[PDB]
Protein backbone atom coordinates (compact mmCIF):
# COMPACT_ATOMS: atom_id res chain seq x y z
CA UNK A 1 0.00 0.00 0.00
CA UNK A 2 2.86 2.43 1.00
CA UNK A 3 4.69 2.93 -2.37
CA UNK A 4 8.18 3.55 -0.80
CA UNK A 5 8.26 0.06 0.92
CA UNK A 6 6.70 -2.29 -1.75
CA UNK A 7 10.04 -3.22 -3.48
CA UNK A 8 12.44 -2.39 -0.57
CA UNK A 9 16.22 -1.66 -0.68
CA UNK A 10 18.87 0.75 0.76
CA UNK A 11 21.66 3.18 -0.35
CA UNK A 12 24.43 4.76 1.87
CA UNK A 13 27.18 7.28 0.85
CA UNK A 14 30.29 8.42 2.87
CA UNK A 15 33.19 10.95 2.44
CA UNK A 16 36.90 10.16 3.16
CA UNK A 17 40.33 11.83 2.59
CA UNK A 18 40.28 12.83 -1.16
CA UNK A 19 37.59 10.13 -1.87
CA UNK A 20 33.83 9.24 -1.59
CA UNK A 21 32.06 5.83 -1.27
CA UNK A 22 28.45 4.89 -2.30
CA UNK A 23 26.91 1.41 -1.65
CA UNK A 24 23.49 -0.34 -2.12
CA UNK A 25 21.81 -3.78 -1.63
CA UNK A 26 20.66 -5.86 -4.68
CA UNK A 27 17.11 -6.99 -3.59
CA UNK A 28 13.88 -6.25 -5.51
CA UNK A 29 10.64 -7.75 -4.05
CA UNK A 30 6.82 -7.68 -4.15
CA UNK A 31 6.50 -7.04 -0.35
CA UNK A 32 7.40 -10.44 1.31
CA UNK A 33 8.30 -12.20 -2.02
CA UNK A 34 11.91 -11.64 -3.24
CA UNK A 35 11.89 -11.40 -7.11
CA UNK A 36 15.45 -10.30 -8.20
CA UNK A 37 18.93 -10.14 -6.51
CA UNK A 38 20.52 -8.26 -9.50
CA UNK A 39 18.59 -4.94 -9.02
CA UNK A 40 21.49 -2.43 -8.66
CA UNK A 41 20.30 1.00 -7.34
CA UNK A 42 23.54 3.00 -8.13
CA UNK A 43 23.90 4.65 -11.61
CA UNK A 44 26.65 7.03 -12.94
CA UNK A 45 26.51 9.95 -15.47
CA UNK A 46 30.22 10.62 -16.17
CA UNK A 47 32.00 10.92 -12.75
CA UNK A 48 28.72 11.74 -10.83
CA UNK A 49 27.12 8.69 -9.07
CA UNK A 50 23.35 8.53 -8.22
CA UNK A 51 21.81 5.89 -5.88
CA UNK A 52 17.95 5.64 -5.80
CA UNK A 53 15.80 3.69 -3.24
CA UNK A 54 11.95 3.42 -3.23
CA UNK A 55 9.35 2.29 -5.84
CA UNK A 56 11.45 0.36 -8.44
CA UNK A 57 9.43 1.63 -11.50
CA UNK A 58 10.46 5.21 -10.43
CA UNK A 59 14.12 4.17 -9.76
CA UNK A 60 14.26 2.93 -13.43
CA UNK A 61 12.21 5.95 -14.78
CA UNK A 62 14.46 8.54 -12.99
CA UNK A 63 17.70 6.77 -14.13
CA UNK A 64 16.42 6.96 -17.78
CA UNK A 65 15.33 10.62 -17.15
CA UNK A 66 18.72 11.80 -15.67
CA UNK A 67 20.71 9.92 -18.41
CA UNK A 68 18.51 11.88 -20.93
CA UNK A 69 19.11 15.26 -19.17
CA UNK A 70 22.90 14.78 -18.50
CA UNK A 71 23.42 13.69 -22.18
CA UNK A 72 21.76 16.95 -23.46
CA UNK A 73 23.75 18.92 -20.80
CA UNK A 74 27.11 17.49 -22.07
CA UNK A 75 26.23 18.20 -25.78
CA UNK A 76 25.35 21.89 -25.02
CA UNK A 77 27.94 22.62 -22.21
CA UNK A 78 30.76 20.56 -23.93
CA UNK A 79 31.76 19.12 -20.47
CA UNK A 80 30.50 16.46 -17.96
CA UNK A 81 28.05 17.72 -15.24
CA UNK A 82 29.60 18.14 -11.71
CA UNK A 83 28.10 16.72 -8.45
CA UNK A 84 27.01 20.18 -7.08
CA UNK A 85 25.18 21.04 -10.39
CA UNK A 86 23.60 17.53 -10.76
CA UNK A 87 22.28 17.78 -7.13
CA UNK A 88 20.38 20.98 -8.19
CA UNK A 89 19.04 19.17 -11.35
CA UNK A 90 17.70 16.19 -9.25
CA UNK A 91 16.01 18.69 -6.81
CA UNK A 92 14.48 20.74 -9.73
CA UNK A 93 13.21 17.53 -11.46
CA UNK A 94 11.59 16.02 -8.29
CA UNK A 95 9.84 19.31 -7.22
CA UNK A 96 8.18 19.70 -10.70
CA UNK A 97 6.15 16.56 -9.66
CA UNK A 98 5.34 18.17 -6.23
CA UNK A 99 1.61 17.05 -6.22
CA UNK A 100 2.25 13.69 -8.02
CA UNK A 101 5.76 12.78 -6.83
CA UNK A 102 8.20 9.93 -7.69
CA UNK A 103 8.30 7.66 -4.55
CA UNK A 104 12.15 7.63 -4.42
CA UNK A 105 14.97 8.52 -1.96
CA UNK A 106 17.89 9.66 -4.20
CA UNK A 107 21.59 9.96 -3.08
CA UNK A 108 24.33 11.83 -5.11
CA UNK A 109 28.08 11.01 -4.64
CA UNK A 110 31.20 12.18 -6.58
CA UNK A 111 34.41 14.32 -6.58
CA UNK A 112 34.36 17.82 -8.22
CA UNK A 113 36.82 17.39 -11.18
CA UNK A 114 38.23 20.98 -10.81
CA UNK A 115 38.37 21.56 -6.98
CA UNK A 116 38.99 17.83 -6.13
CA UNK A 117 36.56 18.24 -3.15
CA UNK A 118 34.58 15.10 -2.11
CA UNK A 119 30.75 15.68 -2.33
CA UNK A 120 27.64 13.71 -1.14
CA UNK A 121 23.92 14.75 -0.95
CA UNK A 122 20.52 13.13 -0.17
CA UNK A 123 16.94 14.12 -1.18
CA UNK A 124 13.34 13.51 -0.02
CA UNK A 125 10.75 12.48 -2.71
CA UNK A 126 9.73 16.16 -3.50
CA UNK A 127 13.41 17.17 -4.00
CA UNK A 128 14.54 18.81 -0.69
CA UNK A 129 18.41 18.63 -0.41
CA UNK A 130 20.37 17.18 2.59
CA UNK A 131 24.07 18.16 1.99
CA UNK A 132 25.93 16.39 4.88
CA UNK A 133 29.78 16.45 5.31
CA UNK A 134 29.87 12.92 6.89
CA UNK A 135 27.29 10.45 5.39
CA UNK A 136 23.84 10.12 3.68
CA UNK A 137 21.39 7.15 4.11
CA UNK A 138 18.19 6.15 2.18
CA UNK A 139 15.66 3.25 2.03
CA UNK A 140 13.60 0.82 4.20
CA UNK A 141 16.54 0.36 6.70
CA UNK A 142 17.42 4.13 6.95
CA UNK A 143 16.94 3.99 10.81
CA UNK A 144 19.43 1.01 10.93
CA UNK A 145 21.91 2.83 8.56
CA UNK A 146 21.73 6.07 10.67
CA UNK A 147 22.61 3.95 13.77
CA UNK A 148 25.56 2.13 12.05
CA UNK A 149 27.00 5.26 10.29
CA UNK A 150 26.68 7.50 13.43
CA UNK A 151 28.88 5.06 15.51
CA UNK A 152 31.25 3.54 12.84
CA UNK A 153 32.10 6.77 10.87
CA UNK A 154 35.17 8.98 11.58
CA UNK A 155 36.38 11.78 9.23
CA UNK A 156 39.38 11.65 6.77
CA UNK A 157 39.40 7.81 6.31
CA UNK A 158 41.79 6.51 3.56
CA UNK A 159 40.02 4.83 0.57
CA UNK A 160 40.77 1.20 1.71
CA UNK A 161 39.70 2.01 5.35
CA UNK A 162 36.51 3.90 4.22
CA UNK A 163 35.60 0.72 2.21
CA UNK A 164 35.52 -1.44 5.42
CA UNK A 165 33.42 1.20 7.32
CA UNK A 166 30.68 1.74 4.62
CA UNK A 167 30.58 -2.07 3.91
CA UNK A 168 30.04 -2.97 7.63
CA UNK A 169 27.45 -0.10 7.88
CA UNK A 170 25.35 -1.47 4.92
CA UNK A 171 25.73 -5.24 5.72
CA UNK A 172 24.69 -4.97 9.44
CA UNK A 173 21.79 -2.52 8.66
CA UNK A 174 20.44 -4.78 5.82
CA UNK A 175 20.45 -7.90 8.10
CA UNK A 176 18.00 -6.07 10.51
CA UNK A 177 15.57 -5.23 7.59
CA UNK A 178 13.24 -7.86 5.99
CA UNK A 179 13.04 -5.97 2.61
CA UNK A 180 16.86 -5.35 2.22
CA UNK A 181 19.87 -7.63 1.41
CA UNK A 182 20.25 -10.42 -1.23
CA UNK A 183 23.77 -9.06 -2.01
CA UNK A 184 25.44 -5.59 -1.93
CA UNK A 185 27.75 -3.41 -4.15
CA UNK A 186 30.29 -0.77 -2.89
CA UNK A 187 31.82 1.95 -5.16
CA UNK A 188 35.12 3.52 -3.89
CA UNK A 189 35.53 6.80 -5.90
CA UNK A 190 38.89 8.69 -6.24
CA UNK A 191 39.57 11.71 -8.56
CA UNK A 192 40.56 9.52 -11.60
CA UNK A 193 39.88 5.85 -10.62
CA UNK A 194 36.68 4.05 -9.38
CA UNK A 195 36.69 0.46 -7.89
CA UNK A 196 33.38 -1.53 -7.66
CA UNK A 197 33.15 -4.45 -5.12
CA UNK A 198 30.30 -7.02 -4.62
CA UNK A 199 30.08 -8.14 -0.91
CA UNK A 200 29.44 -11.68 0.49
CA UNK A 201 26.33 -11.51 2.75
CA UNK A 202 23.55 -13.85 4.07
CA UNK A 203 20.81 -14.52 1.43
CA UNK A 204 17.68 -14.73 3.72
Amino acid sequence: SDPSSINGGIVVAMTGKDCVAIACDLRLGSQSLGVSNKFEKIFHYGHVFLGITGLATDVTTLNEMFRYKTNLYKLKEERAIEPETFTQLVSSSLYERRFGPYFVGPVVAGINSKSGKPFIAGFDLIGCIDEAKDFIVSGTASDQLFGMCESLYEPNLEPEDLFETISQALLNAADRDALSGWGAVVYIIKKDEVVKRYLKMRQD
Binding site: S4, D124, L125, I126, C128, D130
Partner: peptide, 5 residues
Protein backbone atom coordinates in the same frame (compact mmCIF):
# COMPACT_ATOMS: atom_id res chain seq x y z
CA UNK B 1 8.87 10.62 4.30
CA UNK B 2 9.50 14.31 3.72
CA UNK B 3 11.89 16.60 5.52
CA UNK B 4 10.30 19.15 7.83
CA UNK B 5 11.90 24.23 13.61
Amino acid sequence: XFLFX
